[PDB]
Symmetry: C3
């Protein structure tokens, strides 16, 4: 029936933490501390006290033992390592650095207190999604504070699912940007709704799923857009019923950590959400905490920090006397999301004994997860060269000056609330690509086909699934659950090889088993050309402003520029790169031949001068093209024409040489 | 006699965090200061010996005004959503760790850090950070004569009349700019004693006459002042013309006081301990209060003076029993943010973003010393991730500067290294030329300003350390000019000014709400009068380059004495207009010729030759565009490159001309 | 009477620490706290309890008083400083940042617990020599776990010297890479062996020295190689006896902190080793610690951190609740090793009052010591520009993918334990020379004599001594005790000036007194041509794959490329640089004159265009060669191809200007 997971039960039965032995809290101490919470929930959550433990769909407990220990094949990683004799535990993706929300008292003073002395950082931080990821009812002006009304069209979803009303919700998680979710007053993750009644008075039935409000489904993927995609992808779901387990009762409210009417996780905020979308309460001790649980108002009134606040990155009380000590976040708590791939291990016998080298990112079904930018960057040249998040990003102003969409006429949507209203993100950067890649920027600056595209538009497609909307993941088509920006940069040019592949445990192309990034010959992640050129998304401002790129679904270009498969994209690339690489090689061979001749042939001074001059001008051209390294993809006309001139330089020198 | 209204309101309704959370925050510091002021009202000699009677009124200035109200913090607070607009904002003056009111502390002193880090002790100890706080007997640069004239026999001593070393806890400062003193009661020295000696309670307490100023004592003689008056007719020459700002002898001005009219009554705790600190070894507060009033006792129990290792790195650093290691970002002492209602109002894009209307603390009409951080905050360097530590060594902040052997003063001694110096030469990790290669390359060619440093134009000494408003005539780029601006961007305009009065100003001399202007990119900028024609005696580059174009200090011919910004602007236009005109024709030429290369009627070899010439010309355009000074970095070289490109374009046109 | 050092006792008699006065432990507190340990050892170590205090060779106590205070002339530095009126102390090279191994309880949880949440960094750190510098018997698969049999040839050394058996060894220190040492079960540094019996039985005699297993002596420096070296360096030692006090009873076991049969340091791990090759125990208090001492098994059982583990760099407990506070190591605890040189101060009157500017590195006799990369880099352009270890190095994967020497057979050596078996190091870097030095890299990329060398091959010779094997230090010949890589970069071009020189106090070229680095006119350390080009070493994989470079000992090149002195190297450099500089000057002067002429001669527009084209293309060449700054040493053939073109350009423009 109802119990903690195996992993947790095994650690509880034989704990090897350090709190008692060393006076220092470590991973296993966090697994054990969670037991009272689950015991309290099995006795006091309405699902047991009012609904008799009955649900439409099976309840499935998912505590820190599964999230912090088992996730990302941490047991396989552990067995593959020498650490603790191959007998230890590995927390691949979900863990905290400091005390959890089960420890009272804590030393948090709240971001407003940091802001008294650091008013400048408070301002830029406070207009970011870090600051408002956790909010209370009354803090949603972007839907005029109507959490139970349709956001967009009147037949699509509200933020809160039916039967969940604001007075039984501790908080929402998320934004209009991508998705929302909710926590009830007992700090249980909202993996359910209530049909035929309300949670608030124990009426109706608890139903699994239909729990996660999804912007793209609600706004952009109408039945007519779905039917357009279905012309290309004959399995694409159109009717609500074709979304199946991933769906629900109304377009816009999908099932997440649940399958609709079939199963639902039963999970406290402590097991998972506190890692990345946190809050902290001001209670003196845990009794005060347990007495306030189940009362949304009392919990809210005692909330001293919401979301990714100053102290979540910099430590409770920062550097203040009596505080816990200053930290400077490297972001890996919430943005790394390592996941071990036995396939990457098996496929490269050179990696033997180095299970770190077979790390991938957490996948949500067939797409790399949101909050995986760190595990993605780990296998890039950038990271090898010492670059980290803070190299490029401002850590405070992470959302930027984005705004609402005035053209949307929805039932509750209000476009005028700044970033709260926005469908996009524009993080403030310390470094642009053009700061370090000057030759690429130079070629790209010459007026041509993509000369208005940002560097990011080809190099950082929106490959990541935040929603685990597997009903719409058709990855070989570079769509359609595409809400976060890949941090990989390297573009592979190949007719067939894919960035994203199924694990060897997969038995159907759509089962979603053990999907992972593939690695190229340099041991790095890469972006395939279907993602780079032809991806489909509604999260990409650059793409929206460049005619939807080459997506058969969102491109506004003529239809002969709609790219349907990677081989077609590859052949377009080849049409540009092959003549460029031919002229390049011709020049290189010409330069070498002429330097050989100059070592033995004697020429009149004015002719010697000219021959040398042409060789060196040809060399300037080939050095520039070689350093650029795109073989015409950063600007074909400038590139081809410059090389043509250089071939002609070589031809002139050869005539002069032949003459003498 | 009472604490300020601001401090009293917080005392009446405190909302700090020391009791509620075990963590000391801003409001706790306001509250803790009460006992000190109660003690000073009963025990300070002004009251116990002079009966409360002063020539000039006493105006209490505690943390309530310094750490809360300054920089228009209450206006910033009301403009913020933080705490519903009802909070407090510490804009410029606050500490990060315990104040000097908490005993015991964990400070061990810099000599102990020095035992294991002898290398950093050596570089730090020969810096002004190390000696900004000194005790009588530590002033070899004036032969330890604190009561005799430093320079000429008719100019000031460091300590004003009535103030003797034995009633002084310390001096603050150096010969570099200015000195001040604290009395043995740790009250700031905003007064002197006429017809008597403080130590005897004889004579009368007189407001002002309290801050020794190097520039007034040494450089600004009535002869120099008369020379200035010739250009600037309201410039003061006689001592009485210096008015409230002055005093009874040249070289002792009034600061935090107006001569015979008003004087601040302020403990060290309210203000100075933020930036020119000290720490005592007392085991508790009773020992501290028992020593107060005894200079020798305080001195003996002083464990840290000035900006010592632990002031940046934390009491005890990383040592066991220490308070935890810090790495200073310098904003404690070098930021000095100040909110400008005008910057908010003037730019409706800034609405709801009061951080964007931040300026720097002004000392009347000039940006204050220690505002390098609030200046750099609104620069491209800062946007690109650059911070103090990007360019500066944090230890060797003074450099190898020395005294002036040519000065013959009553007490000045020129042989004490940096103590004797008029200048500063901070050690740098990065020079402008390390990152700005095109600019450095053009600037390296022998020409008019090729021997100037980059910093000589880009970083003028715009900042007032002394608040010597008697001599501030900002439209003329003088004359209270002691610290170096960290702005870099130079605006090229006939009239627009860096520094402007606030809209509360009713007279050009009243100095109300002065602030920096912002350009179209939202950045601070340096006007041409500052960049080219400023008058200062703190700038060694300017002293070694014939005084630049200051009508007051220039040793150049008189037509190179620039008297207003329009004149400077016309000189800049004499260079940039022909450059920009030629550049423009070359660029249009290149584009036109490139487009005409698709005309038949052109021999192939003519076609290639045309290309070869416009290609070379494009190199010139690219260098000039990148440089971006339009000849200000080296007119002769810029002209040599453009003359070449003019020939290339005329030769290509000559060849094109045959087609017709 | 066995007692602590003069230096320790003087501080103990007049202590000026901060632990009692301020609640904060500082340097003098660490000196004071070492008393009980030495008193315990004088009473309880087998040297006294089983061998009656008798040893072949004099016992010389060396505690924190000498190591943490007197070393590197800290007393001279102190007297040259204004700090504490010239009357303070200065810890030049050996000191800790946080509690020593004398303080109990501590807050260490061990690297496996860090790695539970940081599995990635655990993996890379765990395959590095930081992780395994401290090991217990049982953990040496690279010798088939035979610490008492010969490693390599049957007539060379085992890791543990005779009389010393695994059961009375707490740990080894080191690797096959360079050398090993041991600590006995009482945590005394192994500066001795036992002849005629076993330490564990109290039989035999304690003999001084012959205590440090040395890879290069054991493997590479056979009597035939030594004879080859002797042909060039006549005083070079060939027979065991010619190694003298530095030597011992078997090739491969040298004397270190000891002179064979003559003297031996008596030193607890606390005095020196715990700075840089540390461990930590889990004991609740110092009683459990002392009760365990002398029992290797119980000490091992209670060892919670070994070697340079996560917490040694990051702090006990890291950032965890109840831990001691996160640190980010800047490496200077173990890799700096500053040493004050009164010669550098005296030779430069400008440095007066500034003793920091006369800092050098720890020397082990006549070679800069291992673990002095920091004091070296401190006087480099790179450091002046803000570069630190972490600019170039990954701090975790510091060993790299190096492997055993397959092809050598030895009685015990096992070549398939990966980095454990390896003779070399390949630290993972964040930045390569070529990332910042583009012009140099471009010229070096052109196929030519050295175009296949790494940048580091010439710029970072293996100048440093790990072993203090002074019997084989002949520094004017750039050999032969050469185990770690110099971090200096700047190459000086001179027929005679040397990087490494003897102090003023030296009275014999081989007495090894006060050796230091010389400083050039820019105030920096520099690499002389002998070290850069013709050095001899067995630690440099780049050199072994490039035919041994120009070493007369290891070079496989023709004998005319065996460089025997610096004057010869210099003459080879001048043969490249002189023609380059001559053409460069010709071009540069010609550009200048052409631009002047253009100001006052008139030409046909079409001629004028030509003169400009030729001058600008010559300028491009001048700017590249000048920025490169090697005057052909980065690629003579290409450098000459560019300058040959630019001489033509200028000649042709002068031709045109003549009419
Ligand atoms: C791409 C690899 C290398 C880089 C990045 C590099 C870098 C440098 C740099 C920055 C300098 C300073 C130049 C100056 O003073 O302006 C230099 C000088 C020098 N390098 Fe290299 N180097 C490389 C490879 C080599 C190799 C393989 C050798 C020897 C075969 C070598 C020998 C020298 C010498 C002898 C100098 C001194 C030149 C002089 O001052 O006269 N370098 N190198
Ligand atoms: O549930 S969060 O990973 O999108
Ligand atoms: O009083 S200080 O800001 O020059
Ligand atoms: O004994 S360690 O300095 O190679
Ligand atoms: Cu997500
Ligand atoms: Cu000042």
């Amino acid at each position: 029936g109802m119990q903690m997971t195996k992993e947790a039960r095994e650690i509880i039965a034989h704990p090897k933490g350090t709190k008692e032995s060393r006076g220092v809290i470590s991973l296993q101490d966090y697994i054990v501390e969670e037991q009272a919470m689950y015991d309290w929930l099995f006795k006091n959550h309405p699902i047991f006290t009012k609904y008799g433990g009955k649900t439409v769909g099976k309840l499935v407990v998912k505590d820190r033992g599964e999230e912090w220990i088992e996730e990302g094949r941490g047991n396989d990683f552990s067995k593959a390592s020498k650490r603790s004799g191959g007998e230890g535990f590995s927390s691949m993706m979900y863990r905290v650095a400091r005390n959890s929300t089960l420890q009272y008292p804590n030393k948090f003073i709240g971001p407003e207190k940091c802001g008294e002395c650091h008013p400048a950082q408070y301002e830029t931080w406070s207009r970011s999604r870090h600051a408002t990821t956790i909010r209370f009812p009354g803090e949603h002006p972007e839907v005029n504070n109507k959490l139970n009304d349709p956001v967009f069209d009147k037949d699509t979803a509200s933020i809160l699912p039916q039967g969940i009303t604001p007075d039984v919700v501790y908080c929402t998680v998320g934004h209009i940007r991508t998705k929302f979710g909710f926590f009830d007053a007992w700090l249980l993750r909202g993996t359910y709704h209530v049909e035929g009644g309300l949670l608030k008075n124990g009426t109706g039935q608890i139903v699994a799923g239909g729990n996660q409000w999804q912007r793209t489904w609600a706004l952009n993927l109408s039945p007519e857009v779905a039917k357009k995609i279905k012309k290309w992808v004959p399995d694409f779901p159109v009717t609500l019923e074709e979304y199946g387990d991933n769906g629900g009762y109304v377009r816009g409210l999908a099932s997440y950590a649940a399958k609709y009417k079939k199963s639902m996780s039963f999970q406290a905020s402590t097991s998972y959400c506190e890692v990345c979308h946190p809050w902290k309460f001001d209670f003196k001790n845990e009794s005060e905490f347990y007495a306030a649980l189940g009362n949304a108002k009392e919990l809210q009134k005692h909330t001293i920090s919401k979301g990714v606040s100053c102290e979540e990155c910099h430590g409770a009380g920062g550097h203040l006397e009596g505080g816990s000590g200053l930290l400077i976040s490297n972001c890996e708590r919430c943005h790394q999301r390592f996941s071990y791939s036995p396939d990457l291990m098996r496929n490269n016998p050179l990696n033997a004994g180095k299970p770190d080298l077979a790390l991938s990112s957490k996948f949500k079904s067939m797409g790399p997860g949101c909050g995986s930018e760190g595990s993605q960057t780990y296998f890039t040249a950038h990271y090898e060269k010492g670059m980290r998040c803070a190299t490029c990003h401002d850590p405070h102003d992470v959302t930027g000056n984005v705004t609402g969409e005035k053209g949307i006429k929805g039932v509750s949507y209000n476009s005028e609330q700044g970033y709260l209203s926005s469908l996009y993100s524009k993080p403030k950067l310390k470094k642009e690509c053009t700061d370090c890649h000057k030759e690429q920027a130079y070629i790209q600056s010459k007026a041509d086909t993509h000369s208005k595209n940002s560097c990011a538009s080809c190099h950082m497609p929106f490959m990541m699934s935040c929603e685990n909307f597997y009903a719409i993941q058709f990855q070989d088509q570079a769509g359609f659950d595409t809400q976060r920006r890949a941090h990989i940069w390297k573009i592979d040019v190949d007719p067939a090889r894919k960035s994203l592949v199924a694990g060897s445990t997969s038995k159907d192309p759509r089962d979603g088993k053990d999907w992972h990034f593939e690695r190229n010959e340099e041991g790095r992640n890469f972006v395939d050309l279907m993602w780079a050129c032809a991806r489909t998304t509604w999260a990409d401002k650059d793409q929206a402003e460049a005619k939807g790129c080459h997506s058969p679904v969102v491109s506004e270009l003529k239809e002969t520029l709609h790219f349907k498969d990677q081989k077609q994209v590859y052949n377009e690339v080849m049409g540009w790169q092959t003549p460029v690489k031919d002229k390049f090689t011709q020049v290189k061979v010409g330069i070498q031949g002429l330097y050989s001749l100059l070592e033995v042939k004697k020429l009149a001074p004015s002719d010697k001068t000219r021959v040398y001059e042409l060789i060196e001008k040809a060399q300037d051209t080939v050095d520039l093209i070689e350093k650029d390294g795109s073989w015409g993809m950063h600007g074909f006309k400038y590139t081809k024409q410059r090389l043509d001139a250089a071939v002609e330089y070589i031809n002139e020198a050869q005539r002069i040489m032949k003459k003498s």
